Amino acid sequence: GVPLRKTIAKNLALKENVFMMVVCIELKIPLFLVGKPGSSKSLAKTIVADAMQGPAAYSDLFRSLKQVHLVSFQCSPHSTPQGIISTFRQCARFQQGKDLQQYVSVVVLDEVGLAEDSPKMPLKTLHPLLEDGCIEDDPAPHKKVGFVGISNWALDPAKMNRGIFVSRGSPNETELIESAKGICSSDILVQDRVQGYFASFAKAYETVCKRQDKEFFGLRDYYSLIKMVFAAAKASNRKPSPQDIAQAVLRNFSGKDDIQALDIFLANLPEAKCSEEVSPMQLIKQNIFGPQEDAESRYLLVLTKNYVALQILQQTFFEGDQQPEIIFGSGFPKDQEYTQLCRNINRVKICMETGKMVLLLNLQNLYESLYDALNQYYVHLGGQKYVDLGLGTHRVKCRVHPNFRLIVIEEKDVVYKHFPIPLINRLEKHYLDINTVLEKWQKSIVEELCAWVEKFINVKKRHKYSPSDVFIGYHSDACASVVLQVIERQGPRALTEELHQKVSEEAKSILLNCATPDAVVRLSAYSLGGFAAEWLSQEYFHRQRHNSFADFLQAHLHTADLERHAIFTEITTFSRLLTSHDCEILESEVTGRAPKPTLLWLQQFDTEYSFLKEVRNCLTNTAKCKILIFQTDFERSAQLIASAKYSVINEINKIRENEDRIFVYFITKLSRVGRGTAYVGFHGGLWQSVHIDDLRRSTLMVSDVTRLQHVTISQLFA
Amino acid sequence: IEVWRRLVEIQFPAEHGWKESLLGDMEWRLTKEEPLSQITAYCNSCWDTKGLEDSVAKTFEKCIIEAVSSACQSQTSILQGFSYSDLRKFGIVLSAVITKSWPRTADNFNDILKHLLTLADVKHVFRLCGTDEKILANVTEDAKRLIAVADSVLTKVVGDLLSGTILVGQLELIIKHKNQFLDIWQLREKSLCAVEEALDWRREELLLLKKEKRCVDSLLKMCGNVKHLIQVDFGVLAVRHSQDLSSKRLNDTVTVRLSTSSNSQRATHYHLSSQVQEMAGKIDLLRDSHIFQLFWRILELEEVYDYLYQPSYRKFIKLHQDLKSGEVTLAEIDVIFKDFVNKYTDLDSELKIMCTVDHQDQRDWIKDRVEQIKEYHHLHQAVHAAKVILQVKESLGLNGDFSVLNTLLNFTDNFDDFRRETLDQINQELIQAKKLLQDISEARCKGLQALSLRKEFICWVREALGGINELKVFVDLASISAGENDIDVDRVACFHDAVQGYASLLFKLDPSVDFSAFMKHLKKLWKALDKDQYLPRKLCDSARNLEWLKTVNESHGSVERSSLTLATAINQRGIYVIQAPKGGQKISPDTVLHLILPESPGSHEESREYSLEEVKELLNKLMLMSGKKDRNNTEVERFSEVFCSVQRLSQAFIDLHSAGNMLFRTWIAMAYCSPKQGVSLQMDFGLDLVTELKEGGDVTELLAALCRQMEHFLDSWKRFVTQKRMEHFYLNFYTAEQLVYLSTELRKQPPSDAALTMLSFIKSNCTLRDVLRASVGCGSEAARYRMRRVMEELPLMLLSEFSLVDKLRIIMEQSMRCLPAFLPDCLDLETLGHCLAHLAGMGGSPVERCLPRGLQVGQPNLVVCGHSEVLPAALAVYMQTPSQPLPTYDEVLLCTPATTFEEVALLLRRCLTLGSLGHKVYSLLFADQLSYEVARQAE
């Protein structure tokens, strides 16, 4: 009677959970379900909330039964008794004024095992609240609300008020094969074809679960494997090919280093004869652009090192208008709190409605709001799907556009240590680092670039500089980012050593774009006028525009591409930031191709909204070219710069109906010595990293350096 | 190159680095070229005659070996299309190619063979070495060794092939790479035709082995499918099949072809019995047949053959002959092909699989059987459609005779006896009824179904609307009623689309509409469902939500759901108020901040007051609602901005309150979300010296500026307090709240008993007369002069500055200078400190303590001991002077996780600061339990 999705495992576990949930809710028995993630508990919760719309039910059965309103509370080690009390009271308020024979309000506690032994011991309130609904106040009939507690962590039965407690263990091979058959049941030819594969995949899954150190893979991974293989066989209309099994296995059971999923699953099968490779970029793509049908795949978790995954994602797949929205924690002084969660979930919702893909940055603290949405258990109305989102005590059903996708970028180690196991199970996990994109020869080029860097720094007295002190913004991954950006700009061109040389030269050019002129002069001097040194001096002083920001701007306006309507540049300097008068000069130079460049100081902004207001004020002008300049003094700050960058990217992506051309410059004032805070640049991706020693046009010296490099000081006065 | 040698070989001393530098620049100029271009110039041009051992030659040789390494890593075959003039230099290049292309596991026989087969340069190396001797003579010794490895590998491979002793992985790689293998071997053998015969022999034998493996795999998979019910035990066969063949020598796994004896019939690793050979062959032929898979219900393999295989094959044979003859009964078609509905291409594949057995050929009858099964399935679907049409007739209330459909129902009731017939003998009348229902697909049946079950919704729609014209008015009312949640608002659109789609049947229909006229009135629905795939679901959703739809007409004209309307009003009229809590309430944002929502002409609702939690509830609501793709976000954004702005102001107030500041104790601020008569901010300090301050403009600019000044004043106040604490010793006995309490009370007559008690810790048994005498000396005439000065000056200073923020900074400065001018009933920290000093002097004798031995004066001493020892030790310290009164908090602090930095700070300040009258001791006990932050700040 209830309209389940066809790919849903109509397994015994969900059957019993629904039956129990219905009977207990209808009769206000407290019911506690404990099991490992994927054990049909939260699914049963949504199904029972949807089916038990008494008069608005889908079947005459539930129309005979009571109408259920759920008030949900997500338990944590930091949850207070007042939270549980207020939840029960809100349910009572819902039950107030109604026939308790046709309506019931239920309290649902999620992850109750987390609250078990917290120092505040809030679950104590459970005992009284389940009996009558009151801790000190006088009883009433409407205060006795129904109750279901769902948890993955074990529970104390004495606190359950002697309710009904159902604890499930990890299923066995027969149960996994029955779940798989249930998933495939929608078609019998496909189900029969895949049947052989079900046993092997179950044995492999139990192997993976016993091998791994921490619970990292669970039942959702197995179920999605069965789903993806069923879909593959269904579209092919033939037995699934080894490559499809490999691809499914890799999509689901990748993300952990000590795991060799495909080797385990292949050990159970002879398909290995093909065993073609699939890269994490192919898998991430297949997730985001999954090849009319309910072939909806889990939301992505990209595990990365040093926020690297964002460069790869922005560059490779989000080249065009598919550019998603970055959901991040603000780095502005007066904005980190509750209100940031409110705005963020508003944006998540808007992207679900509109179908815009989302990137989840340092926002794991948003999971309690997204916990049920990640399950991707959908209510339906008119074909459109709705999923629950909450911000505080309020949970609401919100519309999901079939095109919506969610990518969480997090550090691998933060995920392994802190991330809750059920969150890890709800997401499809892949590891992405530049090393995983670069081929063997591209990695070799990176090694060569690091050697070239050290030579540049020291030699191809002798203070023995460090690369960070010369290539401003240099870091362990700078050369890799450079090579990635170079080859991405080159395209997918096939490998040839000619490409190797061109790529090396491009990489050198970029690093040189980030170099000090002092360093290039040194490099010539210490090479006694070497060929390399003169080539690099030519490129820096003649084929590049470090003489000021105006020269760089002019070169960028003339030479920049026409496809890239948004062009992003990051600038580091040791000089004093530009004032409004310098922007007036830039306007006089630029007028005729763009309006006055807008200069903004990130430090001057206390709130992300105040910043966004001015970004929009600029972007709303009708000029066909716009130059926005953002200024910051590196004194902490990297968070401000990053948040401002993300915001500008998002707002440009939003103001994109126009084909106008936006040039973004981020200007960071550094110190040659420093203050311990090591500026880290070469952020790669959409950005161009350029060092300018001095942004001004040098009125006191009308010369571009490298003219004095062959003139004496006496001649200056002649 | 001549200039390079000339310049390099100049005998400059080595210490200077002439040669190395010049040669580095030359190597640089070389590397700028393409690796293959470098190798081409090296070999083709005869520049080398200059002396093959000079430094330039060795530098270029180095560069060329690096080029060859790059090419080998790139897998670029450089010898293809290559040319050369100097045999020595070409031999050097060739040796570099051989050595660099070699695998890292230089001795792995299989990886050597893989290297030889996969890499093309090997072909060229063998070709060159075969053509003329001069290349081989010029080649190095490492390359000659690697060539000897290649020769040995190839000759072993050939011996294995010819004899049959080859592993299956080698044979597989050789088959995949037969061309390179045979060319390389031909070159070698000319250097030093049966191998083609051998590779063919082994390919045939390997295909046989793989055929048998795949037959056994299919049998194993079948038994694994029936695993859930029947288990088999064939340990020997499962072990044999499980072994990885690549390591296994062919002649052991299978008899190999050699005319040494007759061409023996091949025998495999399995040695399958004849029964199991037949069974596995057939099961392999039907491995993809969905009809042979099910086809059945611990066993041994002979019992598996007898029970499972023979029945299945016999039934499959009989079914295939039934299909050929057409004698297949409708019951058999219904049981077997229940799944192939809408999958007739798969049915065609299945039936050709049945044909593969090569009995009942003609491989064309299946086209007819496929069409007959299409007809049977369409017939049953037509039956379902007819039943749905009858349900729609009774639901909508039609009267047109549909007796003809009874024909299909006449079949549907006598489903069992009629089904004893064949596929072609069914009848022509049912065929005609399907011809009629042809234009209704399962989706169209689903639409009709969504209409049928909903008679109450249909009657209500017809009573309420009566026409599609009215729907729009209804929908407006519904949008007011919706509920601002996506499902709730979307219910309206679901209903609108449902009614616009099913309008023909609901409204246009005449009850006397007959069968075909009903099909055309249905064709309009056909076009609607073609344009909308979820229209039946929208209908059903509307019918499930009928009670709300009923409410729409009479009631929901009034609801006027108001969640964003509330935010809009707050933005227009709303007023946020920040003030010190009344009733001695604890200081918190909730108590400080609250919203007033008035009423305006044209809206005479109740002037409400909202609590911070209610505003946060409204916010959460706005956010979960606000996904509507509309500009309405501006109001939510204004709302959120002002909320956050005011919240920041509130927390600044709380900070100043926590710091002990006094101005912001009677201070009330009204922030008008939109101006009232030109006023956006209003501040009143509750002081007769400070008149009401009001400013207009953007509320958020004023608020940010005011917050920044409050925060600057906070840092300035923290400095001012630290300063007065260094200037006055006794202030440190107290916290900020105690200082505020005392400032207020000591001016009273009489003070509170709590305050005199708090003073007792400085002057034991303190009384009103003690404080009255302590007031002397501190109330200098200079203080009254300052008070008069500030009370007269402030009006002028405030008139000279115009913005609220400058007037407020003036007030803040002057309050730090002379607070008595603003708050006369409070003692400034200086007069308070003086009164405390006077009391302390009027008290008993100073307290003189001495540290025990082992503890150094002027030093921060530290004692480390078991928990139980901590407390007695602290006591011995004071024991040293047992005649001295007992310590108190002034001297001893017992630390807890809840111990705040203010306590440790005040202890340290009491110890180190000057002004004290005696040599007390100061103890900080159980510090390990402190938080890291507090101990850090204390240090």
Coordinates of N, CA, C and O in Angstrom, one line a residue, chain A residues 341-416:
Chain A
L341 N 25.0 28.8 10.1 CA 24.2 27.6 9.8 C 22.9 27.9 9.1 O 22.5 27.2 8.2
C342 N 22.2 28.9 9.6 CA 20.9 29.3 9.0 C 21.1 29.7 7.5 O 20.4 29.1 6.6
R343 N 22.1 30.6 7.2 CA 22.3 31.0 5.9 C 22.7 29.8 5.0 O 22.3 29.6 3.9
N344 N 23.6 28.9 5.5 CA 24.1 27.8 4.8 C 23.0 26.8 4.5 O 23.0 26.3 3.3
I345 N 22.2 26.5 5.4 CA 21.1 25.5 5.1 C 20.1 26.2 4.1 O 19.5 25.5 3.3
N346 N 19.9 27.5 4.2 CA 19.1 28.2 3.2 C 19.6 27.9 1.9 O 18.9 27.7 0.9
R347 N 21.0 28.0 1.7 CA 21.6 27.9 0.4 C 21.6 26.4 0.0 O 21.3 26.2 -1.2
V348 N 21.8 25.5 0.9 CA 21.6 24.1 0.5 C 20.2 23.8 0.0 O 20.0 23.1 -1.0
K349 N 19.2 24.3 0.7 CA 17.8 24.2 0.2 C 17.6 24.8 -1.2 O 17.0 24.2 -2.0
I350 N 18.1 26.0 -1.4 CA 17.9 26.7 -2.6 C 18.6 25.9 -3.7 O 18.1 25.8 -4.9
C351 N 19.7 25.3 -3.4 CA 20.4 24.5 -4.5 C 19.7 23.1 -4.7 O 19.8 22.6 -5.8
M352 N 19.0 22.6 -3.7 CA 18.2 21.4 -4.0 C 17.0 21.8 -4.9 O 16.8 21.1 -5.9
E353 N 16.3 22.8 -4.5 CA 15.2 23.3 -5.4 C 15.7 23.6 -6.8 O 15.1 23.1 -7.8
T354 N 16.7 24.4 -7.0 CA 17.2 24.8 -8.3 C 18.0 23.8 -9.0 O 18.1 23.9 -10.3
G355 N 18.5 22.8 -8.3 CA 19.4 21.8 -9.0 C 20.8 22.1 -9.1 O 21.5 21.6 -9.9
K356 N 21.3 23.1 -8.3 CA 22.7 23.5 -8.3 C 23.5 22.5 -7.4 O 23.1 22.2 -6.3
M357 N 24.6 22.1 -7.9 CA 25.5 21.2 -7.2 C 26.2 22.0 -6.1 O 26.4 23.2 -6.2
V358 N 26.5 21.3 -5.0 CA 27.0 22.0 -3.8 C 28.3 21.3 -3.4 O 28.5 20.1 -3.5
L359 N 29.3 22.1 -3.0 CA 30.5 21.6 -2.4 C 30.5 22.0 -0.9 O 30.4 23.1 -0.5
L360 N 30.6 20.9 0.0 CA 30.6 21.1 1.4 C 32.1 21.2 1.9 O 32.8 20.2 1.9
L361 N 32.5 22.4 2.2 CA 33.8 22.7 2.8 C 33.7 22.6 4.3 O 32.9 21.8 4.8
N362 N 34.6 23.3 5.1 CA 34.7 23.0 6.5 C 33.4 23.2 7.2 O 33.2 24.1 8.0
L363 N 32.4 22.3 6.9 CA 31.1 22.4 7.4 C 30.6 21.0 7.8 O 29.4 20.6 7.5
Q364 N 31.4 20.2 8.5 CA 30.9 19.0 9.0 C 29.9 19.2 10.1 O 29.0 18.4 10.4
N365 N 30.1 20.4 10.8 CA 29.1 20.8 11.8 C 27.7 21.2 11.2 O 26.9 21.6 12.0
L366 N 27.5 20.9 10.0 CA 26.2 21.1 9.3 C 25.5 19.7 9.2 O 24.4 19.7 8.8
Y367 N 26.2 18.7 9.7 CA 25.7 17.3 9.4 C 24.3 17.1 10.1 O 23.4 16.4 9.6
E368 N 24.2 17.6 11.3 CA 23.0 17.4 12.0 C 21.8 18.0 11.3 O 20.7 17.5 11.4
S369 N 22.0 19.1 10.5 CA 21.0 19.6 9.7 C 20.7 18.7 8.5 O 19.6 18.7 8.0
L370 N 21.8 18.1 7.9 CA 21.7 17.3 6.7 C 21.6 15.8 6.9 O 21.4 15.1 5.9
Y371 N 21.6 15.4 8.2 CA 21.7 13.9 8.4 C 20.7 13.1 7.7 O 21.0 12.1 7.1
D372 N 19.4 13.5 7.6 CA 18.4 12.7 7.0 C 18.5 12.9 5.5 O 18.3 11.9 4.7
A373 N 18.9 14.0 5.0 CA 19.0 14.3 3.5 C 20.1 13.4 2.9 O 19.9 12.9 1.8
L374 N 21.2 13.2 3.6 CA 22.2 12.3 3.1 C 21.7 10.9 3.0 O 22.2 10.2 2.1
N375 N 20.8 10.5 3.8 CA 20.2 9.1 3.6 C 19.5 9.0 2.3 O 19.4 7.9 1.7
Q376 N 19.1 10.2 1.7 CA 18.4 10.2 0.4 C 17.2 9.3 0.4 O 16.8 8.8 -0.7
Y377 N 16.5 9.2 1.5 CA 15.2 8.6 1.6 C 14.1 9.6 1.4 O 13.9 10.5 2.2
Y378 N 13.4 9.5 0.3 CA 12.6 10.6 -0.3 C 11.2 10.4 -0.1 O 10.7 9.3 -0.4
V379 N 10.5 11.4 0.3 CA 9.0 11.5 0.2 C 8.7 11.9 -1.2 O 9.5 12.7 -1.8
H380 N 7.5 11.5 -1.7 CA 7.2 11.9 -3.1 C 5.8 12.7 -3.1 O 4.9 12.3 -2.3
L381 N 5.7 13.6 -4.0 CA 4.4 14.3 -4.2 C 4.5 14.8 -5.6 O 5.3 15.6 -6.0
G382 N 3.6 14.3 -6.5 CA 3.5 14.8 -7.8 C 4.7 14.5 -8.6 O 5.0 15.2 -9.6
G383 N 5.4 13.4 -8.3 CA 6.6 13.1 -8.9 C 7.8 13.7 -8.3 O 8.9 13.2 -8.3
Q384 N 7.7 14.9 -7.7 CA 8.8 15.6 -7.1 C 9.1 15.0 -5.8 O 8.3 14.5 -5.0
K385 N 10.4 15.0 -5.4 CA 10.9 14.4 -4.2 C 11.2 15.4 -3.2 O 11.7 16.5 -3.5
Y386 N 11.0 15.1 -1.9 CA 11.2 16.0 -0.8 C 11.9 15.2 0.3 O 11.7 14.0 0.5
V387 N 12.8 15.9 0.9 CA 13.7 15.3 2.0 C 13.7 16.3 3.1 O 13.5 17.5 3.0
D388 N 14.1 15.8 4.3 CA 14.0 16.6 5.5 C 15.2 17.4 5.7 O 16.3 16.9 5.6
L389 N 15.1 18.7 6.1 CA 16.1 19.5 6.5 C 15.7 20.2 7.8 O 14.5 20.6 8.0
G390 N 16.6 20.4 8.7 CA 16.3 21.1 10.0 C 17.4 22.1 10.4 O 18.6 21.9 10.1
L391 N 17.0 23.1 11.1 CA 17.8 24.1 11.7 C 17.3 24.4 13.1 O 16.4 25.3 13.2
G392 N 17.8 23.6 14.0 CA 17.3 23.7 15.4 C 16.2 22.7 15.7 O 16.3 21.5 15.4
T393 N 15.1 23.1 16.3 CA 14.0 22.3 16.6 C 13.1 22.0 15.4 O 12.2 21.2 15.6
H394 N 13.3 22.7 14.3 CA 12.4 22.6 13.2 C 12.9 21.7 12.1 O 14.1 21.9 11.6
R395 N 12.2 20.7 11.7 CA 12.4 19.9 10.6 C 11.3 20.1 9.6 O 10.1 20.2 9.9
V396 N 11.7 20.3 8.3 CA 10.8 20.6 7.2 C 11.1 19.7 6.0 O 12.3 19.3 5.8
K397 N 10.1 19.5 5.2 CA 10.3 18.8 4.0 C 10.6 19.7 2.8 O 9.8 20.7 2.6
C398 N 11.6 19.5 2.1 CA 12.2 20.5 1.1 C 12.4 19.7 -0.2 O 12.8 18.6 -0.2
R399 N 12.2 20.5 -1.3 CA 12.2 19.8 -2.6 C 13.6 19.7 -3.2 O 14.4 20.6 -3.1
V400 N 13.8 18.5 -3.7 CA 15.1 18.2 -4.3 C 15.0 18.1 -5.8 O 14.1 17.3 -6.3
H401 N 15.7 18.8 -6.5 CA 15.8 18.8 -8.0 C 16.6 17.6 -8.4 O 17.7 17.4 -7.9
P402 N 16.2 16.8 -9.4 CA 16.9 15.6 -9.7 C 18.4 15.8 -10.1 O 19.2 14.9 -10.0
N403 N 18.7 17.0 -10.5 CA 20.1 17.4 -10.8 C 20.9 17.7 -9.7 O 22.1 17.9 -9.8
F404 N 20.3 17.8 -8.5 CA 21.1 18.2 -7.3 C 22.1 17.2 -6.9 O 21.9 16.0 -7.0
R405 N 23.3 17.6 -6.5 CA 24.4 16.8 -6.1 C 25.1 17.5 -5.0 O 25.2 18.7 -4.9
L406 N 25.7 16.7 -4.1 CA 26.4 17.2 -3.0 C 27.8 16.6 -2.9 O 28.0 15.4 -2.9
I407 N 28.9 17.4 -2.8 CA 30.2 17.0 -2.7 C 30.8 17.6 -1.4 O 30.8 18.8 -1.3
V408 N 31.2 16.8 -0.4 CA 31.8 17.2 0.8 C 33.3 17.0 0.6 O 33.8 15.9 0.4
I409 N 34.1 18.1 0.6 CA 35.5 18.0 0.6 C 36.0 18.0 2.0 O 35.8 19.0 2.8
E410 N 36.7 17.0 2.4 CA 37.3 16.9 3.8 C 38.7 16.3 3.7 O 39.0 15.5 2.8
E411 N 39.5 16.6 4.7 CA 40.8 15.9 4.9 C 40.5 14.4 5.3 O 39.7 14.1 6.1
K412 N 41.3 13.5 4.7 CA 41.2 12.1 5.0 C 41.3 11.8 6.5 O 40.5 11.1 7.0
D413 N 42.3 12.4 7.1 CA 42.5 12.1 8.6 C 41.4 12.7 9.4 O 41.0 12.0 10.4
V414 N 40.9 13.9 9.1 CA 39.8 14.4 9.9 C 38.6 13.5 9.7 O 37.9 13.2 10.7
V415 N 38.4 12.9 8.5 CA 37.3 12.0 8.3 C 37.5 10.7 9.2 O 36.6 10.2 9.9
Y416 N 38.7 10.2 9.1 CA 39.0 8.9 9.8 C 38.9 9.0 11.3 O 38.3 8.1 11.9

